[PDB]
Amino acid sequence: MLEPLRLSQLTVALDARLIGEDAVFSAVSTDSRAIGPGELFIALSDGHDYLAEVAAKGAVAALVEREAPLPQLLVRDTRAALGRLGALNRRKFTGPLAAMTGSSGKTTVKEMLASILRTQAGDAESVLATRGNLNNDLGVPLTLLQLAPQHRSAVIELGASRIGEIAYTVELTRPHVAIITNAGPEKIVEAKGEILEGLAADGTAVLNLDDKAFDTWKARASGRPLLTFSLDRPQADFRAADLQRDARGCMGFRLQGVAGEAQVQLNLLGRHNVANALAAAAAAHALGVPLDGIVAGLQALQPVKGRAVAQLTASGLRVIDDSPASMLAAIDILSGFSGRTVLVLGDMGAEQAHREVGAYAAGKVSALYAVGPLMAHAVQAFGATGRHFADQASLIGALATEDPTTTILIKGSRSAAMDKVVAALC
Numbered sequence: 001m002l003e004p005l006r007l008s009q010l011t012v013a014l015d016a017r018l019i020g021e022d023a024v025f026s027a028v029s030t031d032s033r034a035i036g037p038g039e040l041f042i043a044l045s046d047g048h049d050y051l052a053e054v055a056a057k058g059a060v061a062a063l064v065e066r067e068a069p070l071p072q073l074l075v076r077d078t079r080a081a082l083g084r085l086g087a088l089n090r091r092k093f094t095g096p097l098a099a100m101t102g103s104s105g106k107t108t109v110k111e112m113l114a115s116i117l118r119t120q121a122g123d124a125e126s127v128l129a130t131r132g133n134l135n136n137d138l139g140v141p142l143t144l145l146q147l148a149p150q151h152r153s154a155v156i157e158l159g160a161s162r163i164g165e166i167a168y169t170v171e172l173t174r175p176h177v178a179i180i181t182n183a184g185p186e187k188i189v190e191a192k193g194e195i196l197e198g199l200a201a202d203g204t205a206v207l208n209l210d211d212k213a214f215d216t217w218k219a220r221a222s223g224r225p226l227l228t229f230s231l232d233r234p235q236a237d238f239r240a241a242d243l244q245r246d247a248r249g250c251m252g253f254r255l256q257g258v259a260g261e262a263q264v265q266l267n268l269l270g271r272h273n274v275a276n277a278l279a280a281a282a283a284a285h286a287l288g289v290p291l292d293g294i295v296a297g298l299q300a301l302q303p304v305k306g307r308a309v310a311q312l313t314a315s316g317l318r319v320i321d322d323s324p325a326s327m328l329a330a331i332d333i334l335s336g337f338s339g340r341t342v343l344v345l346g347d348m349g350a351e352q353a354h355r356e357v358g359a360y361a362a363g364k365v366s367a368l369y370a371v372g373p374l375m376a377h378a379v380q381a382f383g384a385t386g387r388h389f390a391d392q393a394s395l396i397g398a399l400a401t402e403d404p405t406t407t408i409l410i411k412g413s414r415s416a417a418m419d420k421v422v423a424a425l426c
């Protein structure tokens, strides 16, 4: 929060009645197993059972929708009341603020953006970005309350499980720079351009010229300044040429367009993350970050440990540490590789989905090695070139045999502990 607040100051702004003594809080929690002194509890639904627990823990008060051991600020809707507090704390932040939305890539663009800002600051503390996936109707006001006096910029992820959700949250957020990565199918497009509602008349939009929804959006932006990204089109404001994988596989390209020309080597996989990068770069440009604040910040971004970390062993093996729907994503990642490829899975801890996976793999990867009970079914499904295994050891023995140009991908649940196998080769 930017300053602490005081129950009696809010009955007006929140359309609400104070019950019991006044108080001041500096932070809010919607979760009784994670609250402390100087804090407000928001009873959602059932939070209302746990009023002794939060009191005992030192919350100064509770925000309730129905009416006890601490002061109550009573409202009609506590999801709505939270939304208000967010907007309200957002309106005391006077620094630059970007937000983003799309079907996929919004978190990566968030990370790339934060990285660019933080590098440029350079100071990680000073740029506030959505922790995790708190990007929905509770997530975004909670993230907005994180805003505080040490922050000088902010990056906000906006997801939607429906129509209106983003128009609700984007009102709360009211960003200087909006981003749409990509998009029934017409509901999805309508939903994502709801973000253009929260922009000011001169606020910049950032839009994927390749998307089929490009026009709907261009319309909905209504003359606002507009920055575009493409991996195809020479007219776009932000472009990439000479895409070429490095030896670990991560995507290189020459950035181009209005910000200047430069080489960027990312530490991530897939053509799609080049689009993501162009969008983070467009948004950074908009916030007047110079060409190398951008490049430095993109090149400084490591992936999260255990999620698609591509590395290269001293033996010339290419190895992707990724340790269930994702199994299929992973399979497709691997399927984009040119040599022999090899999928390596421990259990996901009905038995059917392991057969489903096995068959799905077949045709897209040279081989599938696996470990644990359930995975016997997958190896079978996948057919001839599959090898099932009795323990990690015989597996790792088999794997130490593979020639370079071969790409290997490991996956499995945390209780399957396949990190044990990444270590064994790295």
Ligand SMILES: Nc1ncnc2c1ncn2[C@@H]1O[C@H](COP(=O)(O)OP(=O)(O)CP(=O)(O)O)[C@@H](O)[C@H]1O
Pocket: 102, 103, 104, 105, 106, 107, 108, 109, 133, 159, 181, 182, 272, 273, 275, 276, 329
């Ligand atoms: N531009 C893009 N086009 C297609 N797929 C993409 C994409 N960017 C990311 N993805 C896919 O989506 C997955 C997760 O990326 P990311 O977490 O940024 O998406 P997201 O945050 O938009 C989904 P969520 O709503 O669950 O947070 C990645 O594994 C990747 O394969």
Ligand SMILES: [Mg+2]
Pocket: 106, 107, 132, 133, 157
């Ligand atoms: Mg996300």
Ligand SMILES: [Mg+2]
Pocket: 107, 133
């Ligand atoms: Mg995500």
